[PDB]
Amino acid sequence: MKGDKKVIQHLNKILGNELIAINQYFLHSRMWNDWGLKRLGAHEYHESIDEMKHADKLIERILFLEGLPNLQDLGKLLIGENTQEMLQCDLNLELKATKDLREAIVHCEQVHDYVSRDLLKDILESEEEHIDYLETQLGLIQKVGLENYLQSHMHE
Amino acid sequence: MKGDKKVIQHLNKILGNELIAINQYFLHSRMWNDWGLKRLGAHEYHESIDEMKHADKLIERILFLEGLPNLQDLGKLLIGENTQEMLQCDLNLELKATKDLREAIVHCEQVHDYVSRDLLKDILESEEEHIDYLETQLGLIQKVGLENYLQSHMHE
Amino acid sequence: MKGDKKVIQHLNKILGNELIAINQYFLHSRMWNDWGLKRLGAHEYHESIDEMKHADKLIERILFLEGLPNLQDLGKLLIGENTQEMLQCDLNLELKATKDLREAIVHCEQVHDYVSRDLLKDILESEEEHIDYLETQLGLIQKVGLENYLQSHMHE
Amino acid sequence: MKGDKKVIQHLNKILGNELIAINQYFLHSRMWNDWGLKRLGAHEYHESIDEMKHADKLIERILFLEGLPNLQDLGKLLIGENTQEMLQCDLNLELKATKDLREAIVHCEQVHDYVSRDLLKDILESEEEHIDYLETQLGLIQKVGLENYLQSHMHE
Amino acid sequence: MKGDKKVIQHLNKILGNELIAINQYFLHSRMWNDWGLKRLGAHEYHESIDEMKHADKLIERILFLEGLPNLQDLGKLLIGENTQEMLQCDLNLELKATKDLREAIVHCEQVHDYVSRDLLKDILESEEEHIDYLETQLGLIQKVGLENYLQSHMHE
Amino acid sequence: MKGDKKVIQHLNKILGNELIAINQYFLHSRMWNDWGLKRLGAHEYHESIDEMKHADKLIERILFLEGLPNLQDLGKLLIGENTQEMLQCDLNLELKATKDLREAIVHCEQVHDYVSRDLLKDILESEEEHIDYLETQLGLIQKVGLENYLQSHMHE
Amino acid sequence: MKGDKKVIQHLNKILGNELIAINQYFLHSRMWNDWGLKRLGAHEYHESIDEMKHADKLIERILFLEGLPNLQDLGKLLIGENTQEMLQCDLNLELKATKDLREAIVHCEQVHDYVSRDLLKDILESEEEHIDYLETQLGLIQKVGLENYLQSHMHE
Numbered sequence A, B, C, D, E, F, G: 001m002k003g004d005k006k007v008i009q010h011l012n013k014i015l016g017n018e019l020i021a022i023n024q025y026f027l028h029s030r031m032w033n034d035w036g037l038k039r040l041g042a043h044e045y046h047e048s049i050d051e052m053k054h055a056d057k058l059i060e061r062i063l064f065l066e067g068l069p070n071l072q073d074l075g076k077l078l079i080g081e082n083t084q085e086m087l088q089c090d091l092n093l094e095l096k097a098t099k100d101l102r103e104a105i106v107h108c109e110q111v112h113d114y115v116s117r118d119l120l121k122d123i124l125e126s127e128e129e130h131i132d133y134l135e136t137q138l139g140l141i142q143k144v145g146l147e148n149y150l151q152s153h154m155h156e
Ligand code: HEM
Pocket: A019, A022, A023, A026, A049, A052, A053, A055, A056, A059, G019, G022, G023, G026, G049, G052, G053, G055, G056, G071
């Protein structure tokens, strides 16, 4: 079904953000596992899988709309050097992602692609849940102290 | 069954206290959940539910006694800005509540409304259990330190 | 996540409406039970519980958006003196509630808070189902007569 | 298998009757549900489904006989404005339906299409069962009064 | 264990009231069953059984306190001749019973027979539940009309 | 609940499209079954049933909004004479259907009927899934050839 | 455990190849699904997942050896425009991948990193299995003809 060209451009932009997130979260997960912080490693793994599932749905939608899904261009990964930095890098990425999702929803609404809007709204709900998690973790570091925070994320 | 008018006023005063506590504990619960202190959030949620159940029983008793349950007047919520203050705010509310329960029981006994007394005694037992919980939490903060106390209440 | 100030004001207005409804429906439920109209009492209890669940979600969303949920201000309860009046009172409240929900959805759409809009849309679906129930009950009173209508609501 | 042309014309006439009945009964069912008369709504829904099943068998038989099933021409729906009228509209439609079924059976017998006759006889048995139901409901309205009759059809 | 003489006199007075209630409720139950009002008959049978259980506990307590339980001196049964009167007769009996229970509890408290008091308080709770049932039934007769009220009590 | 007059006109237009699709898909299903192409017949049957379910929800919404659902006017069925034509007829119908759904959603949004919008969005998601199916079938005929395509749809 | 610098460079080269394959196979999978060739889509999805698992093991090994896994550089995806081209693109990629794996194994052997060798040998076994699959499909296209080959991959 031939989609709106600018809708497809927006969907590819969202896909591009998800592809960054997949790799950033996967690498952060495996870093945390290597450091013995396996509760963080497992949670971050599940965040990476969630982004993979969003990317799949975007690819499927773009193809249905007779566009070409762009899996070739990978933007800049934001990789931290310690737990605090890694959490903040994920939050920085998520804030960019939600800004782009909102702009894409505006355009879908304008051209009456209500099904693409609904898909993006569902992804946005997942991204806001991730922001909630990240903001909460950063706040817990301040409340319990970094050493306690890391202690609490050693074991699954 | 026509109840004593002052018993009904006492029951409405206790109901008023329960209505404050429902909202205070529900808000404290959801604050703690938002902050990632999910064990505190869950415990405080169950405290809010318990006050809802007491309020139900008071409403039912007032109607049986042919009075009008007052759910319109809501007194001042005591909302803290951090965990220590929230616990003290709950304790301050509970101490007011048990004072008022004791005065209501005295009156029920004087007019021979022994069934209303039995209801209020059961509620008083619940409120003294809550006081026990709160005093214990405040004491634990002193024994283990605030950072450890909060750490222990991150995960359910 | 820092939410829009006016969105938070709208969510607090909806929450205020839900808090009125919780208490109005709970009292109506317990009045109907006291009168032996237990099918109405049970249905109205479930309506109160559903409003409690909506209030919970509103509180959680307001806190995520870094606002202060207002559980202190309680508006006017519309309490009837007989079944016909109680049902009409509930309907009057629901019609105010849906007006406020629609105005809140408009504003969420305009600041691109699509997740808050989705929550409010879900609440609006619930409130329109309640309107359907209420209009249907008032119509049945006319079709079967008041005595029969009440008879049919004695037994669960 | 090449069927008799007039048999196929009769089958298309019966199919036309069933298509009116599907839509009339479905609308009556949803009107009754909207009004809170759920037992009537459910029973009328099942009547609509039964007509759908008859239409299916007629379509299948017409195609086997190498005719074209007419799903395009929809005759006049008899929609009532209250329960009494709705039941009588259903009964008026059924009495026309059974007259047409008998005339079709006569013709099938004359040209030795005994399998089409058997199908039409089975449909006729179903339509006479519906007539029994309708006559019985109209009689009950007289015996128990309209308000009681409607009361008895509020709840499933 | 040697009981207070006046406590034992009070317990025998309460026992006498229960013995009246056993017979009154049992006869009302069987009258309602004979009339085809089986839901009333069954409910009233269970009321009679409850009074039998209270009488048992009073007899046991009196014997423990080394008194003689008086099962000989049966007071006046309040027997109605139609449903509304039978319910009112039960209510009149229950109101006398609860007045006597309160006076007995006062005396138990004065002489420190706290276990006798607790037994009487439990009986008082049961009798107030019966009062609630009775007042509710009388109110339902007013709200739904006598003919509907009786209709609703034909079947279990 | 008094709905917007023009919303109700749009819902009746969508309902009219669904009524065409029910009959067109049901007839195509039974044609394919008669020809021995039972996998197509079954799939097309389920498409017809899905349109029946959408029509039901539209009728229910129209009645709730105090409109009259139009089941009387039946537009033009697009009936093919072979598999390729039947699939393209279904696709032509679905493309008209989605255009009308988008126009209806625009209007519902403009008059703040967000619940009707949500219903129509869900229907649009179902219709876009049907368009995906149809486009895919037409493409498969080109890729595997008509003879193989039909072979693959003989057995359920 | 400090690894050999050149071993880590080889592991990152193999990782780089796996990252290309993940995306290439995922896109080919979703292209085939969009075209209705669901058995090819499913198989190609499982090939993508298998490459994801290999990449995970490489990332984990590189981190254990105190290197930095390179998830940032993504090489050229080889995307076909039809089934034959897509299969050949996958085969071309696999043949480059196995050449790189053999060179990496040579070096691991030379510096006595026998555990890294064993990991790469297991990956090489998987990639040769994929080559077997791909060569076999290309051969089947020649033996059964493209139309039959595609027909056989419509249904899972
Ligand atoms: C650095 C790149 C990637 C890595 C390391 C990776 C890793 C993984 C792993 C380890 C799994 C779990 C497999 C299992 O044990 O069953 C998985 C699942 C999955 N991956 Fe990836 N993946 C990557 C990229 C992608 C991409 C780009 C996509 C899609 C565009 C994707 C889509 C999926 C899907 C759909 C699943 C299945 C999730 C589920 O339903 O459980 N992955 N991935």
